[PDB]
Amino acid sequence: HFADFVDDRRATAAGNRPNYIGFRDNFIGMMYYNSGSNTGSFSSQTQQLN
């Protein structure tokens, strides 16, 4: 990007800030834990109770 700009000729440049984007540690936030809104279930069949 530009770090100082006056004219199209005279201007200094500096590289953009390093922005590492990846997943979380232990893949936190992939899955809805602690929710009544989005509650996953491990329910048995025939006795359907969660």
Binding site: N34, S35, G36, S37
Partner: protein, 51 residues
């Protein structure tokens, strides 16, 4: 000479057969009433954020 000793009564038990149970207050050996209102659903969060 044959004195009738009456049985002491039981005072039928709490936490019994028909007992709606909530822990700090006393339970009810009766029927009760619960409500599902839309006034509450307010000041509780993570359940309706745009719903």
């Amino acid at each position: 000479m044959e004195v009738y000793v009456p049985p002491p009564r039981v005072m039928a038990p709490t936490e019994g057969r028909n007992s709606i149970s909530y822990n700090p207050i006393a339970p009810l050996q009766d029927t009760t009433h619960i409500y599902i209102i839309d006034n509450k659903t307010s000041d509780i969060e993570n359940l309706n954020i745009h719903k």
